[PDB]
């Protein structure tokens, strides 16, 4: 369904928010200068979950596969279509006379 | 004062050409738009001949 597309959007948004959080946390260190050297569990969990949902949505957004066997889409092609030959059309048929000229 | 023993490697230069970088950005995005229109028109004309 189309909602899949919407899903991926929020995923990116989630990732974007993670970035902001990470940036802020970096400022934290740039003002604390302590031996933490570790991201908050909340931000990494949020980033990983956003990655998972965004990838799952993207896989759907990629599209639908197509079968290799050439007789798949040609199965429904009745003989009433392949014979038309659009380049070799002739307009000397009963259609013109029968219909309004 | 301040001293830069390494020519201030980690700071933007005072003589940065803002009026050139911004100009090239916003005169090249427009160039991309114009060339996209040109490519579409040429493709249509080649298809129709």
């Amino acid at each position: 369904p189309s909602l899949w597309k919407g899903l991926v959007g929020i995923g990116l948004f989630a990732l974007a928010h993670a970035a902001f959080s990470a940036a802020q946390h970096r400022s934290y260190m740039r003002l604390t200068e302590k031996e933490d050297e570790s991201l908050p569990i909340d931000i990494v969990l949020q980033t990983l979950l956003a990655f998972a949902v965004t990838c799952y949505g993207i896989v759907h957004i990629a599209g639908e596969f197509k079968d290799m066997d050439a007789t798949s889409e040609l199965k429904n092609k009745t003989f009433d279509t392949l014979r038309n030959h659009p380049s070799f059309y002739v307009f000397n048929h009963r259609g013109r006379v029968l219909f309004r000229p | 004062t301040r001293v830069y023993p390494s020519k201030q490697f980690d700071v933007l230069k005072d003589d940065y050409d803002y009026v050139l970088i911004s100009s090239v950005l916003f005169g090249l995005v427009f160039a991309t738009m114009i060339t996209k229109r040109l490519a579409q028109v040429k493709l249509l004309n080649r298809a129709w001949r």
Binding site: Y89, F91, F99 | -
Partner: protein, 140 residues
């Protein structure tokens, strides 16, 4: 029933060469009258089918409209030249169509549409033997 739906239906009906001239001409007229500006150049290929259907449908009134629009948009175009040739053939005007196709051939020799249209004229005239000979020569 949105213009995208009939656009997709027309695309399908063009991908496989159908000849239900009535249905395709009705859908094309609706598209070019109500939703002409709703989409871009993708109607232009439609403007081909719409006239051909007209020549198949016999409703010549919009054939002139489509032809004039295409000609005013695409002057000196071999595809539009063949399309004018079909318009001429719609009323069995064969000499002018043959002259136009000869002019197209002398302007561009690698064009394949003109030969097909001229042999279609020949087979419409009933000269089956000469049409077969012309096709044999063209395939060579």
């Amino acid at each position: 029933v949105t213009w995208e739906e009939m656009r997709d239906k027309m695309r399908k009906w063009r991908e496989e060469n159908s000849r239900n001239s009535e249905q395709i001409v009705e859908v094309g007229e609706e598209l070019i009258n109500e939703y002409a500006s709703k989409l871009g150049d993708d109607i232009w290929i439609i403007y081909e089918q719409v006239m051909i259907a007209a020549l198949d449908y016999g409703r010549d009134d919009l054939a002139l409209f489509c032809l004039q629009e295409l000609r005013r948009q695409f002057p000196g175009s071999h595809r539009v030249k063949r399309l004018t040739g079909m318009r001429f053939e719609a009323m069995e005007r064969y000499d002018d169509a043959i002259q136009l196709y000869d002019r197209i051939l002398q302007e561009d020799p690698t064009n394949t549409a003109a030969r097909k249209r001229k042999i279609a004229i020949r087979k419409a005239q009933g000269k089956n033997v000469e049409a077969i000979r012309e096709l044999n020569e063209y395939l060579e």
